[PDB]
Ligand binder design. Sequence first.
Ligand SMILES: Cc1cc(Nc2nn(C(C)C)c(=O)c3cc(N4CCN(C)CC4)ccc23)n[nH]1
Length: 268
Amino acid sequence: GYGSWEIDPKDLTFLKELGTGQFGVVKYGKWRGQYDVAIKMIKEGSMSEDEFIEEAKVMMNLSHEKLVQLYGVCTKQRPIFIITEYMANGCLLNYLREMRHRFQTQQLLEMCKDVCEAMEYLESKQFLHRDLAARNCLVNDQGVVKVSDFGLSRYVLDDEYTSSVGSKFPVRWSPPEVLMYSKFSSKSDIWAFGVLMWEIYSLGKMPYERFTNSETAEHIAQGLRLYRPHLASEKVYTIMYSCWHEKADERPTFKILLSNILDVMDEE
Ligand SMILES: Cc1cc(Nc2nn(C(C)C)c(=O)c3cc(N4CCN(C)CC4)ccc23)n[nH]1
């Protein structure tokens, strides 16, 4: 079985429906009567057994404070449950678009820092995310941003690349070598991170806000990039822009990006 990862359904309680997507309903509940959890009730026939086993392995091997944590699964009942850590402020993209937060740039840089820490860990484990974007990060009650949409959490979040069976490609988060040749690498994650920084500093604007995906691909083919968001200092823009070098091998690592971000944070 799944050992300690197999959660006893008797230890779950339900409080509120958070969402309903392609792979089923997500509810906010408690585990053991004390721990806040997001509970995904998997729609029967939305994923195969092998897919589940593969994606479970992914989440069970990876663990970091800035990665949305799997708590467990219930697999002896129908429907299947996936139990994850609860993130009270939900999706980062919607969070950024709420104008009432009136974010300081210090807050925005800390969001970047949180994600960069998670990505550095993934980098260290040789794990490629492949769909890093604000829509795929979650925010907890404390304003801490964490990366999700990996392994089983792809199904929890009703990932549109997964639910569209590859139809909806993240063009606006992709480097030229991906758009041209499907050449995925750590450096395609690095590129995505830069675009994410841009999303954060643009308070959740769609990247290439006046372009189609097709115009976007042409724009980057001309060596052109996203402008500096007004809220981003020149130093911050230098960091995000470094992620978009034409040559993949000229792009920084997440280790370097984290050091750059911290240096700017301490400089304020
Ligand atoms: C996996 C996981 C998901 C999760 N929490 C939430 N997930 N989702 C979907 C991604 C399922 C929401 O849509 C959502 C929305 C909110 N509202 C949104 C409205 N805002 C004003 C208050 C917070 C909170 C939490 C969530 N924690 N862990």
